[PDB]
Design a protein around this ligand. Sequence first.
Ligand SMILES: O=c1[nH]c(=O)n([C@H]2C[C@H](O)[C@@H](COP(=O)(O)O)O2)cc1CO
Ligand SMILES: O=c1[nH]c(=O)n([C@H]2C[C@H](O)[C@@H](COP(=O)(O)O)O2)cc1CO
Ligand SMILES: [Mg+2]
Ligand SMILES: [Mg+2]
Lengths: 208, 208
Amino acid sequence: MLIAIEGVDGAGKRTLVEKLSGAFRAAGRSVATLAFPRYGQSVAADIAAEALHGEHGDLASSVYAMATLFALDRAGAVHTIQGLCRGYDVVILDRYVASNAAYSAARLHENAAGKAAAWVQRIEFARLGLPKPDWQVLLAVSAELAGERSRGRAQRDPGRARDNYERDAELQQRTGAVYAELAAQGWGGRWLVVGADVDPGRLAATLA
Amino acid sequence: MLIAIEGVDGAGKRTLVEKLSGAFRAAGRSVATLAFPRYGQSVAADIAAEALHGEHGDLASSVYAMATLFALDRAGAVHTIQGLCRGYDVVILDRYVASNAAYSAARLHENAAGKAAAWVQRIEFARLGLPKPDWQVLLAVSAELAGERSRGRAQRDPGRARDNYERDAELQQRTGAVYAELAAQGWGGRWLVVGADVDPGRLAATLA
Ligand SMILES: O=c1[nH]c(=O)n([C@H]2C[C@H](O)[C@@H](COP(=O)(O)O)O2)cc1CO
Ligand SMILES: O=c1[nH]c(=O)n([C@H]2C[C@H](O)[C@@H](COP(=O)(O)O)O2)cc1CO
Ligand SMILES: [Mg+2]
Ligand SMILES: [Mg+2]
């Protein structure tokens, strides 16, 4: 089974991933995890990160260019995803194809039914062959609370300064609204919306 | 030996490549050839082409985004280049790293000493590890004559319509001027400037 954890920056995805993986393991299932962007593992992922922190000229100014780098990152991990799925019972991902739809739609002030989300659909799933997730969990959180966690993370960790997207409070709010639409739409597969208080044991029972 | 054939669109590079490869073979050396962008062989190369023909939203509007896709294309062919160099005596390329410097510098109205050309240097050679060419041949031609060949190619071949760069006569002229600077500078390795009348036999003797 392939599970994707989605949400805005500072929503608390990586933590939910560690709590979830533990719950599945306390249930007897082997678990594997992968996080996108795969920093350090692919040039596409790295150039993208550097671009969000101000490098590579006008790269980050193009909404479609950024989406492409993130998609090229995933395209390079297809065999790896399939391998993990064959050998493990559960595979949890920290962000997946839906992040590209939500952020791209939000940067262009479009909704989940817009052209950007449809573009991601056509390129990543149909063309690049990334397998659709069995489940997509949306850790819904107030934009204010999320931004607060992102700002705190930057204050206490020099190698964790916020990037362009994280400094745009408006983009984070719109992205939140697009995510909520994607879920109700069942975009790319079935979704499950949870909050900060979601119980890891029950949650893992819903996804089992 | 690694040889790169550079020049503006319609300069006549592919033809010089077929005439050159024949001259080396008539000299007893095995020859191998590769052309960039590697259309059909890599997603990066294909998205780039589609973008130049009007697809993928605002992608082609970013100078650095296009340069990145072309570089990602090459990055994926490094092992292939090295393999060809080990097994063959001569390897001729239809366009290589210098095209990214010339076109990028020209789109930004910079010269060969500008930041764009320096960026390509840092990312493709130093970071991605593409081997520098032993020789870089610049097929210098009048911008007018080149554009004339590009327009004729489009009239007689439906699958050969000009792309964005080819329709910009001003970009083609500036790109020509940047190329001439790159050569005099010996950018990326030694250069050889030739014209339409260059003799394939002698030329191949200079590169032998
Ligand atoms: O496909 C994507 N599209 C996309 O826009 N992103 C965004 C989310 C962030 O602002 C950034 C990477 O974020 P992070 O390292 O916090 O997961 O890029 C991330 C991905 C996944 O790679
Ligand atoms: O690195 C590059 N940078 C770059 O700007 N180009 C340009 C030249 C063209 O206008 C186009 C591809 O051209 P062509 O198929 O005629 O070789 O992209 C081509 C390459 C090589 O890939
Ligand atoms: Mg982030
Ligand atoms: Mg061309």
